[PDB]
């Protein structure tokens, strides 16, 4: 634990963060830590700050991994990691703040059209292709981890479950993902690769169509069994979708991992070419935000 502290203390910026931030509002208080929105004194930028008491963090290596991965894998489609501070055993992680909530708010409060869905899928695939090319698997892709700007910008977040692979050890076996969004091979085999993120993107697409991932109202243990034994999930109203969207979904949700599209391949898919401008999402984001408070 002392070593963890020393490692963290090499990573963080020096001193106390309060020099820097004005106007803390508490928007969250989980097991993960307490989350504030705040304002950067120098830049005027609005930030989201996570405060953690390290005494009560069970798996601190995960936090170090999260910061190190985020630091070295900056991308326009990933929520920007800005800075970190350590004051005694109080750790602060500073992230950029996106004022448009999450995709979850949008899919549960509004109805996306295919052009809007294509835009979101494209932006997510941009993040995934970058990560995968860098040998990083996110492992917990789902609408809650897709954050939005008021302008329609789409960004991936939460690297607390991510994995770094290598040519020597190119597959992982740990089950860390949220069950409704897990690829079947995670439970059926003891090895999976980057394409688990592609499956999860497909489930997210289903969220955007139907408002929920398949089996949501089943016990998570049961959903995992159902995922593994049913395979590619079935839509309620397939006929209502365009042929090209159905094809895109089939490619994300292929049971055979070798046949499932890779992010690089999917970026070329013609479904993404129907994407509306990202600002088309702004009215949905506003409506969802109002609905949620």
Q: Give Dmax (Cα) for the chain.
A: 59
In terms of DSSP bridges, do strands 146-148 and 34-40 run parallel, antiparallel, or are they unpaired?
Answer: unpaired
Please give the Cα distance from 215 to 268 (Å, whole number): 30
Main-chain dihedrals φ then ψ at residue 202, nearest 5 degrees: -65, -40
In 60-158, the DSSP E strands lie at 81-87, 90-96, 136-137, 146-148, 154-156
Residue 201 host element (H or E): helix 195-210
Q: How far apart are CA 3 and CA 17, in angstroms?
A: 23
Under a CB-based contact definition with an 8 Å cutoff, are residues 155 and 284 in contact?
no
140 carries an active-site annotation: yes
Catalytic residue among 40, 113, 140, 151: 140
CB 257 within 8 A of CB 116: no
Residue among 235, 279, 290 at smallest CA distance from 120: 279
Report the 10 Å Cβ neighbour count for 37.
Answer: 17
Q: How far is CA 128 from CA 73, 80, 143, 195, in A?
A: 11, 15, 14, 10
* Helix H or strand E encompassing 52: strand 46-53
Torsion angles phi and psi, residue 94, rounded to 5: -105, 130
- Residues catalogued as catalytic: 140
């Amino acid at each position: 634990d002392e070593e963890i502290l020393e490692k963290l203390r090499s990573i963080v910026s020096v001193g106390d963060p309060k020099k820097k931030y004005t106007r803390f509002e508490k928007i969250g208080q989980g097991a993960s830590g307490t989350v504030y929105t705040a304002m950067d004194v120098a830049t005027g930028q609005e930030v989201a700050i996570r405060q953690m008491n390290l005494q009560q963090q069970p798996k601190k290596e995960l936090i170090i991994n999260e910061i190190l991965v985020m630091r070295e894998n900056k991308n326009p489609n990933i929520v920007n990691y800005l800075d970190s501070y350590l004051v005694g055993d109080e750790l602060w992680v500073v992230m950029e703040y996106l004022a448009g909530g999450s995709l979850t708010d949008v899919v549960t409060e509004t109805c996306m059209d295919e052009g809007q869905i294509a835009a979101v899928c494209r932006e997510c695939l941009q993040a995934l292709e970058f990560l995968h090319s860098n040998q990083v698997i996110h492992r917990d892709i789902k609408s809650d981890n897709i954050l939005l700007g008021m302008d329609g910008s789409v960004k991936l977040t939460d690297f607390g479950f991510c994995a770094q692979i290598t040519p020597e050890q190119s597959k992982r076996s740990t089950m860390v993902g949220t069950p409704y969004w897990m690829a079947p091979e995670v439970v059926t085999r003891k090895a999976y690769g980057p394409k688990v993120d592609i499956w999860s993107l497909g489930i997210m697409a289903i969220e955007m169509i139907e408002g929920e991932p398949p089996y949501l109202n089943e016990n998570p243990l049961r959903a995992l069994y159902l995922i593994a034994t049913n395979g590619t999930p079935e839509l309620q109203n397939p006929e209502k979708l365009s042929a090209i969207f159905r094809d895109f979904l089939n490619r994300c949700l292929e049971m055979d991992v070798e046949k499932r599209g890779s992010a690089k391949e999917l970026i070329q898919h013609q479904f993404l070419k129907i994407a509306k401008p990202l600002s088309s999402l702004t009215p949905l984001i506003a409506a969802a935000k109002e609905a949620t408070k």
